[PDB]
């Protein structure tokens, strides 16, 4: 008959889960800008998770999208398109030190 005993509720303080920059966006092969954000400017390589920082789902999606856009003739493979050079940098890599 003690009313000071704890209640078996789930954690109220529990934070929301953090989100990929793209959580509930739509990656489309047709838009070369968003894609070329995740590409190395000098090489044309695709950055990995440790760099882009995405849910597995969206890293996959970006990748497949990039490949498709590359062979369909939308986006260049061997460099980032100069036009998109000065777009926001979301990636964590620093070349010049």
């Amino acid at each position: 008959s003690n009313e000071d005993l704890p209640v078996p509720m789930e954690n109220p303080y529990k934070e929301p889960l953090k989100k990929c920059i793209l959580c509930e966006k739509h990656v489309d092969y047709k838009n070369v800008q968003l894609l070329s954000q995740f590409i190395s400017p000098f090489t044309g390589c695709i950055y990995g998770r440790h760099i882009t920082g995405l849910c597995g789902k969206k890293q996959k999606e970006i990748t497949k999208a990039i490949k498709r856009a590359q062979i369909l003739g939308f986006m260049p493979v061997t460099y980032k398109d100069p036009a998109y050079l000065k777009d926001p940098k979301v990636c964590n890599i620093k070349y010049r030190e």
């Binding site: 000098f42 100069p82 070349y95």
Partner: protein, 86 residues
Amino acid sequence: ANHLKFIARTVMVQEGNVEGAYRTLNRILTMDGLIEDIKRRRYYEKPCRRRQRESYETCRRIYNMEMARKINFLMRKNRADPWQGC
């Protein structure tokens, strides 16, 4: 080859100092694994050798990561000790 030339893997020299420019370039290429891949492709490596190399490298990375993590987690306690000659 079918891409436009001079847009990729290219660095412009600043104020005529070439060494620093080449260094920047080499750091770029190393960053993207391009150097390791140039080197690895000089001789063919059979798929199982490759598989092994990848597995080992990932194990190595896990260990290094974890060790660096315990290091930085423990770094605070490198301070001079309060209780000396207790």
